[PDB]
Amino acid sequence: DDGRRPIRRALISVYDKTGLVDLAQGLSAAGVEIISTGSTAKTIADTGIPVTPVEQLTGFPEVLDGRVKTLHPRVHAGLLADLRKSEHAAALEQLGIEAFELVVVNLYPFSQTVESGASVDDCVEQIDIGGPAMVRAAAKNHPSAAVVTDPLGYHGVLAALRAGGFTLAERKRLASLAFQHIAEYDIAVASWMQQTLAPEHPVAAFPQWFGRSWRRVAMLRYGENPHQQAALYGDPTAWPGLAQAEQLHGKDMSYNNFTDADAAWRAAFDHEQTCVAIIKHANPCGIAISSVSVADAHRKAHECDPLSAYGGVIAANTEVSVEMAEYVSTIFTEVIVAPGYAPGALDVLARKKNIRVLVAAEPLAGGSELRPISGGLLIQQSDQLDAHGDNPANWTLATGSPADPATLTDLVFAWRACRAVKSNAIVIAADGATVGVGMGQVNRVDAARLAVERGGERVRGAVAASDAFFPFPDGLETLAAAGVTAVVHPGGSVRDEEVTEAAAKAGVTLYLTGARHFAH
Amino acid sequence: GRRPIRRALISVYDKTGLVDLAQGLSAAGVEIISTGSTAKTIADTGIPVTPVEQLTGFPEVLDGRVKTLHPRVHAGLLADLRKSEHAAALEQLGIEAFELVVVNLYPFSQTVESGASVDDCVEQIDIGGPAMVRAAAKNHPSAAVVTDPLGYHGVLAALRAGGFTLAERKRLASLAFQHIAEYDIAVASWMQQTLAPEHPVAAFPQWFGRSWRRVAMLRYGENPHQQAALYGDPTAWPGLAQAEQLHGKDMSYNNFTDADAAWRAAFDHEQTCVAIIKHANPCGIAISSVSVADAHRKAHECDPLSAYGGVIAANTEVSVEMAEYVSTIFTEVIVAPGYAPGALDVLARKKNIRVLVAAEPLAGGSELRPISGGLLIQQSDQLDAHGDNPANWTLATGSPADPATLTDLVFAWRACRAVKSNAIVIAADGATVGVGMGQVNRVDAARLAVERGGERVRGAVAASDAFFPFPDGLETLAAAGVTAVVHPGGSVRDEEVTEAAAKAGVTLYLTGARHFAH
Ligand SMILES: O=CNc1c(C(=O)O)ncn1[C@@H]1O[C@H](COP(=O)(O)O)[C@@H](O)[C@H]1O
Ligand SMILES: [K+]
Ligand SMILES: [K+]
């Protein structure tokens, strides 16, 4: 047996009356008795459909401006009696109470009331008490009761009605969806109460309690490596990002595709000029800006390390042109992400069957960054390159002639690009493009040597940025000996003088920012 | 906005401090309305109790499922006494208000953790309890709701002061909704996983929810211009977020990520292991069949310059001998499952070193990786793939590895997980000697490992966390004198890489398992 229980009596109390009339018409036609609260009963009764008011059942009126209407045992006994138990079924009979097979409830629009910029009191008034009590009761008692919390499931109710009720398995599923809905509502209420109702004094950057939930977008083929299973989740209350990106072409997105596309997208939007960033398994192949075109930024970004760009992930901070798309079609690329594509650009990209072509919403300023650790979570403000020392007008010229406008643009480019590179990081750049990148080293002099080696013949006359201060002169000397003309670093070492003297001996322009951009 | 307490509604799972709370309330002339074991615990002391059935006048049915879901309870909780109409509605109905509500639930995460059956878990779902807490929290301008015995001292103080202030009632309301949120996340999670899983069952559920409690505000995040905080998951198995600090200054944000990385790297080996990290990067990792002090010396010797200001993790108790050597090296953090008698005193000679005690990690587990607008969740790389067992390795070329070479290969293979990709680990005698880390190009990682390894590379073994895309990466190792190399294989150019190892007389193993990490 499927555990089907024919629907005879339904309890309906909905804030949102979308699809209610069609649902009620279907239920009344099947001979289902509808029990409803005030305005739900009005909406149904105005159609000519008979309604049993909740007060008729309880003998107690709706009081305190709709605060205590259904918090009565003559409602909850019909919801909570476990009809698998002879004792519970007899108790309903002793009380003259009948069971509810269907419970249709949707909550006060608390999160919408909050988003509309409503007052503290109107938000508090939109906290539903009876609604969640009815949903939780019916969900707990799923072996007997079917609970529907979304008008999206109303046609499924009418189908179950035609089939002689919901199955036990269908009632288990409804109960799980219902408690998901309740946890989401509670998360919104508890978060708002902490932030607005009772904030700390003095106000702290991060609250004492933090809660979030996500909905699965897709199961992935695997995680970072084939032996690990993985899934993608979307935060429905968040501003759209990579998790909500629209896929226009290509095969399924892998786990590594999402982390690379996320890293590439953030690196491209770290620059105000037209920017293309190329990432391969979390590491930058090349990054470039352009005052000509997006195609020019892509060519220059690709030219940094063309070998590593094959199989890479491309992000553009502006619309991808047909010209860029033509060149991208000749290079093995796993993913391309952009805020848009020019007419005809997608067709050129769609020539290669596998490339994942994504459209993502431009990121927002600020925002928190979640970093799990064993047993907990670290939360910090996203490094948005907006520190006092990130503004070049606040930089200190420690030695050398001031940077000309083209040198300063390259220095600022290399400085901002250094954030995306894992520490210890050295970015050598020229004409708005990275030419040599020293990445992820425990030792800064190893990062400097890597940037010089990978930069090759393009290092002489270029500029360099260091994401943290040079602890010793050797890292800077490595750059100066290779022909780097201008270097920007945070400074802040007791040995800064020794590093500045080494730049002075080489005739290198040296800027001290007073801001650092460690990234792991 | 102080409101004198006259009537209290009490129903609690955790009976800690209940008798003292009730004695204080009865002495002030507060009427106590209670039910169940809470009512008996209070009544057995001689304190008078108004049972909920006397208030409601409704018979006990359905094993108590609806006893508090009554307007004689909820009208008293929900009447907005700021409204003259609600105060008069209460008088025309004959129902008195509640100024205090003391309710705490059986943590459902503990109901599921206690190993209760599906039927018992379903039976444990509290309806009335959360309804009472929610009602009083919503009606905080009139009602004070206490959901933790830790706030009972504050209740008695408020009682002496003529009630709680409006501001404290707002704070209690916020704390009450957090305790409801946490309860409902645990029921909803247990329902995705156990009550109503997908058919066929998926490795990760359709909905995922979690909450955390702030442990501390940090001085800053990764860099000074970023504000940050540390959170602990109270329903999780203890980790770095719950580590006990025995000595030193405040833990920084970077101290926690480094200590977390070090702890995981040390527990990636079954033998006594010490891992040293700096900037999420490994300075040195070593195993030992002698002592923890021997593993630390060998780990330190990999890159002693970078170990200065580093973070140390040991997968076993730190001895006095290890502590003596650690006291001569500038160290930011030391994390261990314990410290031998006298070891802490030796470490405490240096005022700043943060000395931590952490619980040993558990097998399996999910790894959370946020992305813009969402979250990636995957199984933690626990080095338990088919290809991680050396009996499942394929000898592509060369003579089989002797027992000492195979131990070094397995050590280098497992150590490669902790190194950010593209990673090359050169090792000898259970210790890393040269590490090529975080490169976009594998040949750059091979060159780095060889350069940093120096004179210790000739005769050593090497592991590659992903396949060699070209022979050059392997040739870099072979030309430096590496005798045996282990990598996943899986490239169309594997034969060319194997031919390059053959030409060099290098033993080459193909695992069929990869360990990318970022
Ligand atoms: O907090 C109060 N919420 C309660 C209560 C109670 O406190 O007893 N009963 C029903 N609700 C909710 O009232 C809304 C439906 O009511 P109407 O029929 O009046 O539209 C729906 O949103 C129901 O959820
Ligand atoms: K960086
Ligand atoms: K790795």
Looking up residue B13, the CATH number of its domain turns out to be 3.40.50.1380
Beta bridge mates, B425: B435, B463
Beta bridge mates, B343: none
CA of A61 to the centre of ligand 1 (A): 13
Give the CB-side neighbour count of residue B52, counting CA atoms within 13 A. 27
Same domain, A322 and A465: no
Q: Does A172 touch chain B (CB under 8 A)?
A: yes
Same domain, B149 and B266: no
β-pair type (B461-464, B424-428) = antiparallel
On chain B, the residues whose CB falls within 8 A of the CB of A133 are 69, 127, 130-131, 134
Give the CB-side neighbour count of residue A307, counting CA atoms within 13 A. 8
- Residue for token pair 């006494």: B81
**E strand or H helix at B435:** strand B431-436
CA of B379 to the centre of ligand 3 (A): 15
Q: Where are the alpha helices (DSSP H) in B66-165?
A: 71-78, 84-93, 108-113, 118-124, 128-138, 152-160
Same domain, B396 and B349: no
Residue A175 lies in a domain: yes
Write the DSSP assignment of A387-422 as a string of letters. SGGGSGGG-EEEESSPPPHHHHHHHHHHHHHTTTSP
| CATH label of the domain that carries residue B289 | 3.40.140.20
Residues 6 or more apart in contact with residue B512 via CB below 8 angstroms: B386, B387, B392, B394, B488, B489, B490
Ligand 1: residue of A15, A110, A135 to mutate (most ligand atoms within 8 A of CB) is A15
CB contact under 8 A, A234 and B373: yes
Residue B206 lies in a domain: no
Question: CA of B107, closest CA in chain A: separation in Å?
Answer: 15
Measured at the alpha carbon of residue B53, what is the angle toward residues B48 and B58, in degrees to the nearest 5? 165
Nearest to A243 among B373, B452, B515 (CB): B373
Same domain, B22 and B132: yes
Contact at 8 Å (CB) between A369 and A210? no
Q: Does B439 touch chain A (CB under 8 A)?
A: yes
- Residue for token pair 């190792």: B477
**Which of A201, A216, A232 is the endpoint of a domain?**
A201
Question: CA of B162, closest CA in chain A: separation in Å?
Answer: 21
**Which of B321, B345, B362 is the endpoint of a domain?**
B362
CB contact under 8 A, A80 and B239: no
Residue among A114, A175, A100 at smallest CA distance from A142: A175
CB contact under 8 A, B440 and A82: no
Residue B62 lies in a domain: yes
Nearest to B177 among A91, A186, A515 (CB): A186
Longest alpha-carbon distance in chain A:
99
β-pair type (A209-219, A230-234) = antiparallel
Residue among A486, A482, A480, A475 at smallest CA distance from A446: A475
**What is the C-alpha separation between B516 and B465, in angstroms, rounded?**
6
Q: Which amino acid is at A77?
A: A
Indicate the number of domains in chain B. 3
**E strand or H helix at A427:** strand A426-430
Based on the residue annotation, tell me whether A17 is a catalytic residue of this protein. no
Q: From start to end of A274-425, where are the E strands?
A: 274-280, 283-290, 312-316, 333-338, 356-359, 368-373, 376-381, 396-399
- Residue for token pair 């002099």: A445
SS3 A329: coil
Residues 6 or more apart in contact with residue A119 via CB below 8 angstroms: none
Q: Does A64 touch chain B (CB under 8 A)?
A: yes
**What is the C-alpha separation between B282 and B301, in angstroms, rounded?**
12
Nearest to A186 among B79, B184, B281 (CB): B184
In the structure, which protein residues have their CB atom closer than 6 angstroms to any atom of ligand 1?
Answer: A 13-15, 36-40, 66-71, 105, 107-108, 128-131
Q: Does B446 touch chain A (CB under 8 A)?
A: no
CB contact under 8 A, B371 and A175: no
CA of B49 to the centre of ligand 2 (A): 64
Residue among A23, A61, A290 at smallest CA distance from A146: A23
Question: CA of B113, closest CA in chain A: separation in Å?
Answer: 16
**What is the C-alpha separation between A65 and B86, in angstroms, rounded?**
9
Same domain, B306 and B424: no
- Structure tokens belonging to residue A176: 């799980």
- Substitution target in A58, A60, A62, A68 with the highest count of B β-carbons within 10 Å is A68
- Residues B357-373 as b or e (16 or more Cβ within 10 Å = b): bbbebeeeeeebbbbbb
CB contact under 8 A, B181 and A180: no
Same domain, A317 and A407: no
Q: CA quadruple A33, A39, A43, A45: dihedral positive or negative?
A: positive
Q: Does B70 touch chain A (CB under 8 A)?
A: yes
Longest alpha-carbon distance in chain B:
99
On chain A, the residues whose CB falls within 8 A of the CB of B436 are none
Same domain, B452 and B506: yes
Residue among B354, B394, B111 at smallest CA distance from B245: B354
**Which of B345, B362, B379 is the endpoint of a domain?**
B362
Same domain, A356 and A407: no
CB contact under 8 A, B65 and A71: no
CB contact under 8 A, B373 and A129: no
CB neighbours of residue B378 within 10 Å: 21
Nearest to B239 among A172, A373, A437 (CB): A373
On chain A, the residues whose CB falls within 8 A of the CB of B379 are 223, 228-230
> How many helices and strands (H and E) does chain B possess?
19, 21
> Exactly one of A140, A172, A352, A422 is catalytic; which is it?
A140
Nearest to B138 among A129, A285, A386 (CB): A129
Residue A518 lies in a domain: yes
CA of B476 to the centre of ligand 2 (A): 28
- Structure tokens belonging to residue B518: 């970022």
Residue A80 lies in a domain: yes
Determine the atom of ligand 1 nearest the C-alpha atom of A36: 18
CA of B102 to the centre of ligand 1 (A): 25
A 100-159 residues inside an 8 A Cβ radius of B = 124, 127, 129, 132-133, 136-137, 139-140, 142-143
Same domain, A70 and A152: yes
Q: How far is CA A380 from the centre of its chain?
A: 15
- Chain A residue at shortest CA distance from B220: A380
Write the DSSP assignment of B254-290 as a string of letters. HHHHHHHHHHHHHTTSSSEEEEEEETTEEEEEEEESS
- What does the CA dihedral A68, A73, A74, A75 come to, rounded to 10 degrees? 60
Whether omega for the bond prior to residue B224 falls within 30 degrees of 0, making it cis, is no
Same domain, A45 and A128: yes
- Residues B242-276 as b or e (16 or more Cβ within 10 Å = b): bbeeebbeebbbbbbbbbbbbbbbbbbbeebbbbb
**What is the C-alpha separation between B507 and A64, in angstroms, rounded?**
82
Contact at 8 Å (CB) between A8 and A27? no
Residue A348 lies in a domain: yes
Give the CB-side neighbour count of residue A25, counting CA atoms within 13 A. 9
**What is the C-alpha separation between A413 and A434, in angstroms, rounded?**
9
Based on the residue annotation, tell me whether A489 is a catalytic residue of this protein. no
CA of B391 to the centre of ligand 1 (A): 64
- Structure tokens belonging to residue A417: 């690009």
B 248-277 residues inside an 8 A Cβ radius of A = 253-254, 256-257, 260, 263-264
Contact at 8 Å (CB) between B223 and A517? yes
Ligand number nearest CA of A444 is: 2
**E strand or H helix at B353:** none
Q: Does A197 touch chain B (CB under 8 A)?
A: yes
Same domain, B175 and B83: yes
Nearest to A227 among B202, B263, B513 (CB): B513
Residue A226 lies in a domain: no
Residue B83 lies in a domain: yes
Domain that holds residue B401: 389-518
Residue among B310, B285, B294, B263 at smallest CA distance from B411: B285
CB contact under 8 A, B214 and A209: yes
Q: How far is CA B18 from the centre of its chain?
A: 31
Same domain, B35 and B171: yes
**What is the C-alpha separation between A81 and A9, in angstroms, rounded?**
14
